[PDB]
Amino acid sequence: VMKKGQRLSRDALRTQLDSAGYRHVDQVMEHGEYATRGALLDLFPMGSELPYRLDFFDDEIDSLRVFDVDSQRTLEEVEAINLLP
C-alpha cells in the first residue's frame, strides 16, 4: 500500500515489481505494467480498475495521481493506493 508523502526506494520498488511479475514498458496501457520517466513512475496494479502515476521528489512520493491510459493524462489526485502481493 502506497501513500502521499511516504518515503521509499526507487530501485527497491522496480526490482520488486519485476519479481511480482509486472512488465517494464515505455508507456503504461494495461494491467501489470509500469513505466519510468524521470521523477515519475506509472503503475497499473493487477486488479485495479484505474492506473496510477507517482511523482517522486528525491525519495519521497509527492503526489499519487490517476491517469487515463489512452490520453496518458493526469486526472485527480489520490492520497493512497494499495497493492496485491
Binding site: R10, D11, Q27, A35, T36, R37, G38, A39, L40, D42, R53, D55, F56, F57, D58, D62, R65, F67, S71, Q72, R73, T74
Partner: protein, 121 residues
C-alpha cells in the same frame, strides 16, 4: 563543454549539499507562437510539470501563450536533493531524449541563481 551522461551527473552532485535542483528538457526556446501542439504532445508523452516563461505549470492544464509573444518551454523531468546517481543518469538520458540532446539544471529555491547547461552532442 559537451559531456557524457556520467560527466553531467557528476557536475550536478558536485553541488552544495542538500540544495534542491530541477532537471529540465528544453523544448522550445524564445520562439513566438501558441505552441498548442508541443504542449499537447508533451502531455501525451506522460509528463506533468513544465517551466513556461520561467513559471512552473501543470501540463494537464497549461497557461495560454500569447500568439505574438516570445515563449520558451521546458519539461521538468526530475526534482532532487543532492546527497542515488543511477536514477539521475536515467533522468538525464530521458531529458536528453525530450530535447535533442540538451539538459538544464536549475536551483528550485532561488530562480535568479545561475543555471547549468549540459549538452550531449
Amino acid at each position: 563543454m559537451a559531456s557524457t551522461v556520467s560527466q553531467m551527473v557528476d557536475n550536478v552532485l558536485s553541488q552544495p549539499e542538500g540544495k534542491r535542483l530541477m532537471l529540465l528538457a528544453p523544448i522550445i526556446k524564445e520562439r513566438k507562437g501558441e505552441h498548442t501542439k508541443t504542449l499537447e504532445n508533451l502531455a501525451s508523452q506522460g509528463y506533468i510539470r513544465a517551466r513556461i516563461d520561467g513559471e512552473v505549470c501543470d501540463l494537464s492544464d497549461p497557461p495560454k501563450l500569447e500568439l505574438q509573444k516570445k515563449h520558451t518551454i521546458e519539461v521538468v523531468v526530475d526534482r532532487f536533493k543532492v546527497r542515488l546517481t543511477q536514477r539521475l543518469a536515467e533522468s538525464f538520458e530521458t531529458a536528453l531524449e525530450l530535447s535533442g540532446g540538451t539538459a538544464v539544471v536549475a536551483d528550485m529555491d532561488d530562480p535568479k541563481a545561475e543555471e547549468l547547461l549540459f549538452s550531449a552532442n
